Amino acid sequence: MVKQIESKTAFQEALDAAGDKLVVVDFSATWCGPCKMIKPFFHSLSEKYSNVIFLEVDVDDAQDVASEAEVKATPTFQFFKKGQKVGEFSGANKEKLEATINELV
Questions:
Q1: Residues 74, 59: contact at Cβ < 8 Å?
Q2: Sites of the modification N6-succinyllysine?
């Protein structure tokens, strides 16, 4: 499924609510163009892998999560689990999402 994080509040509750399932967060500028251009891939796995939780954080609406996350290079994909960052990588490599997702799958 998917969950829009509007504030750090939903961020914490989203990780604890995820349970022990994989949790990949995507930090991109929804207002940007070439950045949101990689949404038919990451946000698209929602239909291919229904057993994966994808979080969509807007570095413009939730600047609180972007600041605490120290994300100064978008797009960025972080891998959280049980509420612990266990993997991360920045770059427009949508193909990498598969190799990485199959890592903690």
A1: yes
A2: 8, 94
Give yes or no: 39 in active site: no
The experimental method is NMR
Catalytic residue among 10, 29, 35, 52: 35
Structure tokens at 100: 């990485």
Phi and psi torsions of 12, nearest 5°: -65, -50
The amino acid occupying position 31 is: W
Q: Give the whole-angstrom CA distance, residue 90 versus residue 63.
A: 18
- Report the side by side order of strands in the sheet with 76-81: 2-5, 53-58, 23-28, 76-81, 84-90
Establish how many alpha carbons lie within 13 A of residue 90's alpha carbon, considering only the half-sphere containing its beta carbon: 10
Q: Is 35 a catalytic residue?
A: yes
Q: Identify the active-site residue in 1, 2, 17, 32.
A: 32
- Structural domain boundaries in the chain: 1-105
